[PDB]
Design a protein around this ligand. Sequence first.
Ligand SMILES: *Cc1c(COP(=O)(O)O)cnc(C)c1O
Ligand SMILES: *Cc1c(COP(=O)(O)O)cnc(C)c1O
Ligand SMILES: O=C(O)CCC(=O)C(=O)O
Ligand SMILES: O=C(O)CCC(=O)C(=O)O
Lengths: 435, 435
Amino acid sequence: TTPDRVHEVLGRSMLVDGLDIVLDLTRSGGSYLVDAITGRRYLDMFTFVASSALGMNPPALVDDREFHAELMQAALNKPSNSDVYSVAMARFVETFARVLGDPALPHLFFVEGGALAVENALKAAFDWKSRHNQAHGIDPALGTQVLHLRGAFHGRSGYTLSLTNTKPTITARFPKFDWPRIDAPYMRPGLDEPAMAALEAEALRQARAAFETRPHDIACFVAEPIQGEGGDRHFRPEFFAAMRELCDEFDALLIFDEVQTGCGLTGTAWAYQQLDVAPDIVAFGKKTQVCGVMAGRRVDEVADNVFAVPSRLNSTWGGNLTDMVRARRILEVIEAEGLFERAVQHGKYLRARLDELAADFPAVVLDPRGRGLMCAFSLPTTADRDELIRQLWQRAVIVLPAGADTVRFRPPLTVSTAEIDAAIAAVRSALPVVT
Amino acid sequence: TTPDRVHEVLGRSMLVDGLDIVLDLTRSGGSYLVDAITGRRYLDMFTFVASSALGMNPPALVDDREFHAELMQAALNKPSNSDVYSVAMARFVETFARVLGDPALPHLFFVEGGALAVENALKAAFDWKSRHNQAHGIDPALGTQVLHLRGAFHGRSGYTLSLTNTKPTITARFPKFDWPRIDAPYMRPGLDEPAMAALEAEALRQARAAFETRPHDIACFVAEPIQGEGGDRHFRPEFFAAMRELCDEFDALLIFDEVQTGCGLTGTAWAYQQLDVAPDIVAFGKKTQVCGVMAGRRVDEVADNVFAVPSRLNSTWGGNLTDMVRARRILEVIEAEGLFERAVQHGKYLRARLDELAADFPAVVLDPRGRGLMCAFSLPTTADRDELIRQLWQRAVIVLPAGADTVRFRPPLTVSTAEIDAAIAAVRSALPVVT
Ligand SMILES: *Cc1c(COP(=O)(O)O)cnc(C)c1O
Ligand SMILES: *Cc1c(COP(=O)(O)O)cnc(C)c1O
Ligand SMILES: O=C(O)CCC(=O)C(=O)O
Ligand SMILES: O=C(O)CCC(=O)C(=O)O
């Protein structure tokens, strides 16, 4: 089976709705994808839905003969790391703790899949709330609901389908728990301090009302620090600092879903580090390759929590050993080359260019915004947005849509300023055509 | 970090409750695990919780220089196969269809994780039932419940936690849907044809009552063809053939969870092929490395089902490309070496030895049973079971417990009769010590 026959072969068994290219695994590299059919190079601001930190075939991985051997050893088999430990696994865990760890959150748990990472964070919270309730003379049957935001995306699994609320296509006709959902008070253009404060106060009012009308039954509040799939919606730190206090007042855990924001994209290991709010639990995935949770803060107040008691959390493999070995090497590159700081600097550059676009096309390029390399802007209508994406595709630049009218940039941490310039030049070329 | 320090390093971040050994990834091979600390060899009847078809480092994979290159190419990166297709992916899909495919079930969907495979089978059914209901003038809000068995294990995720019911530790304090659950009429020793028929009739009665008291609201019946984690409980084909008819009478899909039974263990590609019952959907995982669903039969009667409509099912990666490339090569070995048939023959051998043990130790070795290499026996009490497992561990044989009193054998498809003899010799040695 040959590149030109890939779509045909797959189409016999599956819905074939992805990109028109066929990925060349060997010739792709850095910020460029290679189409195996034409040899055409594509500028990648998409990074496999933001899951690639360094882009394709990074030199530090490709030229490292010792790493090749370690990776091969892992890749040939697939141990259940739940039950059977290895040196490869222990090296990953210690480097994860060194590069991404938070001293307040020492409990680590790994699994395959971002939705399942979020689910295990939820399970930790449900168990914590039931046991905390029990220890304080409250019915242990209480502690089963999850406070969350409108416009949230947390995955497509049994619990996260009750949380995710963006496109109806994701959730329609699937059974759900009736869990309390509040307005998301995100920053929008032309709202000053007082206007924002009033927006947040209303969300906060709705949050308090949920806690007071479902006493002892809300186990946690879950949020994305920046809502990705719902449209790159950013929140003031003040909002989360208030939610942190409300969570403590009502003995509920605060969980951040960093599956999209995490591993350096915003300029720090985690987006929450820049908001100055301490979570009790963090779910991670995508760029980390292996998915999972970090937990601590109030979790440790319940001595028999899911991190302390055998067999409360589990999966067959406990994460993919091949992903752990790759992730270990990627984390070492990040640490050695100062890639968080490179993300801060190139992030400021990308954002400056989007501000320039906004000035040049004030009616069309709306609400330029970003933290580190996680940047976006919006168009007047969804028709304009969809057309801009098509026009960029014709010009060999891959970007992702979000929400009704957003275009998002998800470059690798290793993106150069020339690559950012090429992307911006493509947008400038395409814009007169869309208008 | 050195083998002797692995447990120490991990224990700083996680609950360290697995095996005492440290896996040597290089020196392990075939039916033997090597402890990197001592160099001691362990006879493996555990196969990473039945997820390894060929055992460690199979020669056909290890000596194949071309495969090394293909595997390396896949392992270096982690594409989102949801969006971006490759030759590596298409080769896996076409070989999966050739070796494991069923002409009635042409729709394939892949994901990381066995619980998520089962969940997507459930989502397919919920959508199917709602749309089928709608097409026939029934409220589309109906079609949200799942008929299932007592003693079932389907995973630890949001939907499967409402289905799984073995150890309370798995499910306690996690919110659940109230879905109908019926008695499991499994074969037990000293029940003849008429006695079994009466047991099944009672389960069937309970099934019918569920359908009649929740009209149009049961989307599917899910079962393991042989219950694994609940205790290697086997069912007559007559039971499932009756359930197949009842499912059709009430317009509900029949789903088999073959995550544990699948990929040759019972002597055929799938256990259902030996029961002569046609499912509408099959969930797979473990030995297949990549997890997922095969669907067809009645699913196709609803033209806008989840396999025909974009974005109803999804995950970020759509399965691990490294797992697809490994699985492709493993499937080729199975096909080339006739490993399904080898499983039938060595399965008969293993079962014959368990019958012999039963004869020699009639009060102690209870209910020897099996299909292909999926074999087991039970002990009088759980204390006896736990002790036998410990005694086997001291003798360097790894087996797994199940339920209250079962010991299960999960050898690789490539196990030899001498290896089976060694395992049985260890059990014979340990038994006088347990009594
Ligand atoms: C992608 C995503 C998930 C789901 O991850 P998958 O690997 O596709 O299951 C969860 N939360 C957020 C914020 C996401 O970006
Ligand atoms: C293992 C198992 C699952 C769950 O698989 P994971 O990869 O651990 O999520 C589902 N069903 C059955 C029958 C199982 O054996
Ligand atoms: O739709 C999905 O399942 C993945 C979506 C996602 O993570 C994103 O596009 O930001
Ligand atoms: O407990 C788990 O999560 C995995 C169990 C399983 O699949 C088994 O032991 O048969």
